[PDB]
């Protein structure tokens, strides 16, 4: 079963900065990585599918990149509403698994 490592577990940035979350898979999984955002008391929300593809209604400052084992979710110019926990999820092999999450602090 594929371990997804999200490190560091907390990222601290200043408003307007570009930030990058890391997700490393324990084996090669092509681009079958998906990213979710979960705010305090909220349900998870899909941000990026298949490592880099946009979702309708997600602000354009969100992007994703990587393939194989190394994946990055990036935010251009962080702002306050981006304060949340961020999870990656793989669908390359059964069962689907989740990363342990990165908290964004401003």
């Amino acid at each position: 079963d594929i371990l997804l490592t999200q490190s560091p577990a907390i990222l601290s940035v200043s408003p307007g900065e570009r930030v990058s979350f890391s997700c490393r898979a324990s084996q090669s999984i092509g681009t079958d990585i998906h990213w979710y955002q979960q705010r305090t008391n909220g349900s998870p929300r899909l941000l990026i599918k298949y490592a880099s593809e946009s979702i309708s209604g997600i602000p354009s400052r969100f992007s994703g990149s990587g393939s194989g084992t190394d994946f990055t979710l990036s935010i251009n110019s962080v702002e306050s509403e981006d304060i949340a926990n961020y999870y990656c999820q793989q669908s390359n092999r059964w069962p689907f698994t989740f990363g342990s999450g990165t908290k964004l602090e401003i």
């Binding site: 079963d1 669908s91 390359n92 092999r93 059964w94 069962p95």
Partner: protein, 103 residues
């Protein structure tokens, strides 16, 4: 009206049906199984095409008993449908050559 052409057309539509059903059933069969990769429908249709043509890259394949049985159905349907097309082409050529020599 000619039998060979209608059988070719039938085989084509049957093959499309088998590719779609094989995609659905391969996902159904493989999601139980740790390590399985044949578990989402878009790539399962791709896998079913490569299985039906025998053009098999090795990027996807079933690991369960029932996924492999689905695979066998797709293989035989593909090989049989293309063999049927070959046989119809031969029947057409044989008829046209009987005409060209006036028989």
């Amino acid at each position: 009206s000619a039998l060979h052409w209608r059988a070719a057309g039938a085989a084509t539509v049957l093959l499309v049906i088998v590719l779609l059903a094989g995609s659905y059933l391969a996902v159904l069969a493989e999601r139980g199984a740790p390590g399985a990769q044949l578990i989402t429908y878009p790539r399962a249709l791709w896998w079913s095409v490569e299985t039906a043509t025998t053009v098999c890259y090795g990027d996807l394949y079933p690991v369960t008993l029932w996924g492999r049985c689905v695979a066998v159905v797709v293989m035989v349907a593909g090989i049989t449908s293309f063999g049927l097309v070959t046989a119809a082409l031969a029947t057409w050529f044989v008829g046209r050559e009987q005409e060209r020599r006036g028989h």
